[PDB]
Structure 1
Amino acid sequence: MLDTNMKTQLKAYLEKLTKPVELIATLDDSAKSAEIKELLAEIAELSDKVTFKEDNSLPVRKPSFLITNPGSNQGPRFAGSPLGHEFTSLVLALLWTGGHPSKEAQSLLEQIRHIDGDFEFETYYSLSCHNCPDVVQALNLMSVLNPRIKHTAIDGGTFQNEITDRNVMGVPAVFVNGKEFGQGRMTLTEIVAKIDTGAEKRAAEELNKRDAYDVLIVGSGPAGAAAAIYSARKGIRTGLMGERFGGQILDTVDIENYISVPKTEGQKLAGALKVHVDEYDVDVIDSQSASKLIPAAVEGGLHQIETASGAVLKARSIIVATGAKWRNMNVPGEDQYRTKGVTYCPHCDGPLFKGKRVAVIGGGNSGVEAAIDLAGIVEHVTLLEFAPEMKADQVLQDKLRSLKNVDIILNAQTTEVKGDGSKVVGLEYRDRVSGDIHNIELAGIFVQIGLLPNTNWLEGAVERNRMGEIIIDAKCETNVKGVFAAGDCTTVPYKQIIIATGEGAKASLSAFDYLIRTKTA
């Protein structure tokens, strides 16, 4: 039922065919079936690339035909007349099946190819339906890109029959696997959303496709945040990635040494950092965890970060700001009395125990230095050391043994933190030698057994000291060009919020200075 212009115009399009096309028909003795036989022979006529063939014993619509390549059973099937407004759809299904390319978003297309679930679409149209082609053409394209997406297009002029049976009251009307999918004007983009629950992952492929950063900051505590603020203010493209925005300050309550602010709270401060961050153009990336640094192979290259989630981000410069973890005793009551008398930091919380008894756990330099600090402020200090002797510098031991409100206990292993449901009232320990159990009354317990930088994931990539800290010069430079570090994860001597933010700012200004010094066209 091709007219003069469709025939001549189709001859033009058909010479685009790089591949062989077969139209496989399944037909009864109906007038319409003859209508369709005729049509297919008319098209086979117009190119040696197209051959027409019958198989009338197949479990499908009569009349219908498949458009495929030789040997495949993959491609769009029309049932009824593929003309009317759908002539362009017919041409197009032929063209694609014979290797003319889609006009579409290539990315969308590869998305379609790699899709797991099975699917059997069916669209209802009528020849006069001005809107049905885009939808038909959309879903035809799918059947060609992936064999697990079947698509039959149904002309309602033939099966006025079936329109009734599924009570379709308006066309185009799409169905998936028997279930009603939707109707009216749906672009390819919208159908593909609806269909694939898909990979949730691609924040992942989403990360992989983002552009290289001028600077990418890893770790979003105080240090990383300060870095980000200083970076974005120079207008360079900046990314701040980390596991959990706020870092260690999220798990603290009272903070009295964030200079200028007499008293704030961990949560308030983390939120105030977020707000200060969001004033600038910063790609903030939360709950991602860096698992490797790949240093640039050349002086104008890109550094790369891998994430535990599998993604790879790229940057001209990196700032690592992953902080550290204070070693826990791991004993019953510890978790329960964090911030309620169990603390990890004498500078932070010392003044809160004037008049009170406290313990320090750890006989290293950390603890011993902590006990002398606390001794000056508190009514009494007990230091518990796990081993038979203290690890501290002798000159610190002497000094701590000099004082008159301190007790040192050796071989002592804390077994329990004791509170009253609200706050610490004591401590329980074991003599590791005798196995006997002892009890102390106190209000504060300062754990000073060790810091652990969050830097194992950099082994071999940048240089660390013997405690895991990333070595930096005053400019926050590591031993790899273009890679900087700030905060508790570095060799910086003291671990504090106001110190962390400062280093962050420094690292960023060094990063900027590096970027501008390094280009050479």
Structure 2
Amino acid sequence: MLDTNMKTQLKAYLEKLTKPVELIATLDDSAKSAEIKELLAEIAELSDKVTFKEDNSLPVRKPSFLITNPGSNQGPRFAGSPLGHEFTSLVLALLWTGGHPSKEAQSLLEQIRHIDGDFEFETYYSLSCHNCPDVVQALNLMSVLNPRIKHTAIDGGTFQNEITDRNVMGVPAVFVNGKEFGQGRMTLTEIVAKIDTGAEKRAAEELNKRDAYDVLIVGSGPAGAAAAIYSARKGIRTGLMGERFGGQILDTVDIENYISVPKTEGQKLAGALKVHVDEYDVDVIDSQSASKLIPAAVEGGLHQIETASGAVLKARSIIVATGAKWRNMNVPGEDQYRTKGVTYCPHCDGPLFKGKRVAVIGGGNSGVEAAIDLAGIVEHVTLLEFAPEMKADQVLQDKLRSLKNVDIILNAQTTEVKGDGSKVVGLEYRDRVSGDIHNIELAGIFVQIGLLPNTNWLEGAVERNRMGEIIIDAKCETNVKGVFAAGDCTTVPYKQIIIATGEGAKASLSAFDYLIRTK
């Protein structure tokens, strides 16, 4: 079966074996079974560390053989001929099983050992195929590294009926637990990536190892970033964790009121915040969400933050800077025209609409103030109120109705934002009583339905007002000793970047003062 060349190479690699290896065949009386038998004999005679056994009573394919260690049933199975262009695959299988290490990275190898699921792989190959080896070898290696991962490599030239019954149209053809998995060349990395779902757990295990922090800042927007800088500058152990470094500003373009910078941009500004943070000793943790706070049982103890990923961080002081989310209209066109006429901020975008018509969505204090605000700058304001009447303070309603370039539409529910492919040109809405549809021509839509502070994760831990805002005092202190908050998520009455950053700096100074008095 093997020629002189093949024996020579094989004997060369068998000499790299440390551990003994068993080849357990299950055969019938076919010529192909005889060939396999002859084959395993030739390999065995090339090494005192390779033993050939039969066990023809096993419920596996005939012929096939298992590549395993003494006293084990773990390892790759080859059904049919393992020669032709699978010869290298066979050789590698003997090697790995007998102790010889893979060339793959250790990140990859550990990942494979830690795969947390039960998988039975079957690879259909043929002896002339050039894409098959890499696939077969990848799966083979996994069977060696992880006993929950099983692999049988099948020669389609021996099991033609399986090829036909299973409607395999090309090789290599992979199935996992009976389901089609892949076709064509896949890398070990790719295969591992298809089935591994342990990334979240690994990240969480990294985090669990972190030492306690002097200050742990939750939320990495402008407020959290500012706090981190003020904290780290004092040389204390500072952690900064957040879902997305940069916060709300990543979703805007032009910013013209970040004091002393006449014009910057949301993405650019977040990049600058990151550079400023990285000048100091800040442990920045990204793509993580605090899911619970557990206050120290007594003052001076450690506060604990749990993450959605399952980790627990601990710290002598906490700064909550999780900001907020504006409520959307949830209509077609809305997302598409964000920064192109749809805006959530009159303080920010008001001056860009001189001589233009705009709408304000929402009739509470925010919307109605926004309307009055814009009315003094723009040519015309239409306010849309969903309900039969506005909720805003009466003095605001009176003021707005006194304005000459304003109309108010009650019972009005936006249905669509209309643009010209580039910017907003109008608004479609429904009158909720009659059901009639109406269109308004305008250049801007200020959505002012309400703000949603990112604080429900804190329910029962720290006190919030009736709007979800974390109640703070002048020192950014919550009702929990050692726990502070800064920026949009708090009761700070205005939501702006320069405001958030000032608060993050106050909160950080307060947290430091707290550490001095309790440590």
Q: Same fold (TM over 0.5)?
A: yes
The within-5 A match list for 1:79-158 is none
TM-score, normalisation: structure 2: 0.66
Matching residue of 1:59? 59
Report SS of the residue matched to 2:200.
coil
Shift of 1:283: 0.6
Aligned-partner Cα distance in 1 for 2:34–2:498: 85
Cα-Cα RMSD: 9.2
Shift of 1:69: 17
Shift of 1:73: 11
Contact 2:292 2:306 in 1 (8 A): yes
Shift of 1:446: 0.6
Q: Please say which of residues 87-96 and 264-273 is displaced more in the overlay.
A: 87-96
Shift of 1:465: 0.3
Contact 2:428 2:438 in 1 (8 A): yes
Shift of 1:325: 0.6
Summarize deviations over 1:81-120 as a string: whole Å, max 9, x none. Answer: 9999999999999999999999999999999997769999
Q: 1:47 to 1:425 in 2, by over 3 A?
A: closer
In structure 2, stretches of 5+ residues that fail to align are none
Q: 1:214 to 1:40 in 2, by over 3 A?
A: farther
Contact 2:2 2:39 in 1 (8 A): yes
Q: Please say which of residues 434-443 and 33-42 is displaced more in the overlay.
A: 33-42
Q: 1:5 to 1:313 in 2, by over 3 A?
A: farther
Q: Please say which of residues 193-202 and 82-91 is displaced more in the overlay.
A: 82-91
Q: 1:232 to 1:182 in 2, by over 3 A?
A: farther
Matching residue of 2:234? 234
Summarize deviations over 1:338-396 as a string: whole Å, max 9, x none. Answer: 11111111000000001111111111000100011001101111111111111010011
Aligned-partner Cα distance in 2 for 1:86–1:455: 58
Q: 1:319 to 1:19 in 2, by over 3 A?
A: same
Q: 1:329 to 1:178 in 2, by over 3 A?
A: closer
Summarize deviations over 1:10-67 as a string: whole Å, max 9, x none. Answer: 9999999999999999999999999999999999999999999999999999999999
Aligned-partner Cα distance in 1 for 2:429–2:156: 84
Q: Please say which of residues 406-415 and 148-157 is displaced more in the overlay.
A: 148-157
Aligned-partner Cα distance in 2 for 1:88–1:333: 57
Aligned-partner Cα distance in 2 for 1:368–1:170: 66
Aligned-partner Cα distance in 2 for 1:156–1:402: 84
Shift of 1:320: 0.5
Shift of 1:441: 1.1
Q: 1:510 to 1:49 in 2, by over 3 A?
A: farther
Summarize deviations over 1:234-281 as a string: whole Å, max 9, x none. Answer: 010111100001000001001000000000000100000000011011
Shift of 1:201: 3.0
Aligned-partner Cα distance in 1 for 2:171–2:424: 73
Q: Please say which of residues 133-142 and 255-264 is displaced more in the overlay.
A: 133-142
Q: Please say which of residues 75-84 and 496-505 is displaced more in the overlay.
A: 75-84
Q: 1:130 to 1:245 in 2, by over 3 A?
A: closer
Q: 1:151 to 1:502 in 2, by over 3 A?
A: same
Report SS of the residue matched to 1:214.
strand
Aligned-partner Cα distance in 2 for 1:342–1:313: 39
Contact 2:201 2:310 in 1 (8 A): no
Summarize deviations over 1:165-208 as a string: whole Å, max 9, x none. Answer: 99999999999999999999999999999999976631210100
Q: 1:517 to 1:142 in 2, by over 3 A?
A: farther
Summarize deviations over 1:465-495 as a string: whole Å, max 9, x none. Answer: 0000000000000000000000000000000
Q: Please say which of residues 305-314 and 489-498 is displaced more in the overlay.
A: 305-314
Matching residue of 1:358? 358
Report SS of the residue matched to 1:200.
helix
Aligned-partner Cα distance in 2 for 1:157–1:433: 72
In structure 1, stretches of 5+ residues that fail to align are none
Q: 1:99 to 1:391 in 2, by over 3 A?
A: same
Aligned-partner Cα distance in 2 for 1:441–1:99: 75
Q: 1:108 to 1:314 in 2, by over 3 A?
A: farther
Contact 2:226 2:505 in 1 (8 A): yes
Aligned-partner Cα distance in 2 for 1:253–1:246: 13
Report SS of the residue matched to 1:151.
strand
Give aligned pairs, total.
519
Contact 2:429 2:437 in 1 (8 A): yes
Aligned-partner Cα distance in 2 for 1:284–1:430: 46
Matching residue of 1:19? 19
Matching residue of 2:318? 318
Aligned-partner Cα distance in 1 for 2:428–2:187: 69
Aligned-partner Cα distance in 2 for 1:29–1:114: 41
Q: 1:365 to 1:86 in 2, by over 3 A?
A: closer
Q: 1:75 to 1:300 in 2, by over 3 A?
A: farther
Matching residue of 2:456? 456
Matching residue of 2:430? 430
Q: Please say which of residues 427-436 and 176-185 is displaced more in the overlay.
A: 176-185
Q: 1:293 to 1:200 in 2, by over 3 A?
A: closer
Contact 2:24 2:67 in 1 (8 A): yes
Q: Please say which of residues 97-106 and 398-407 is displaced more in the overlay.
A: 97-106
Q: Please say which of residues 159-168 and 475-484 is displaced more in the overlay.
A: 159-168
Aligned-partner Cα distance in 2 for 1:83–1:386: 74
Contact 2:115 2:198 in 1 (8 A): yes
Summarize deviations over 1:115-142 as a string: whole Å, max 9, x none. Answer: 7699999999999999999999999999
Q: 1:92 to 1:514 in 2, by over 3 A?
A: farther
Q: Please say which of residues 400-409 and 491-500 is displaced more in the overlay.
A: 400-409
Report SS of the residue matched to 1:65.
strand
Report SS of the residue matched to 1:24.
strand
Q: Please say which of residues 465-474 and 8-17 is displaced more in the overlay.
A: 8-17
Contact 2:334 2:342 in 1 (8 A): yes
Report SS of the residue matched to 2:201.
coil
Aligned-partner Cα distance in 1 for 2:329–2:342: 10
Aligned-partner Cα distance in 1 for 2:437–2:167: 81
Report SS of the residue matched to 1:47.
coil
Q: 1:16 to 1:447 in 2, by over 3 A?
A: closer
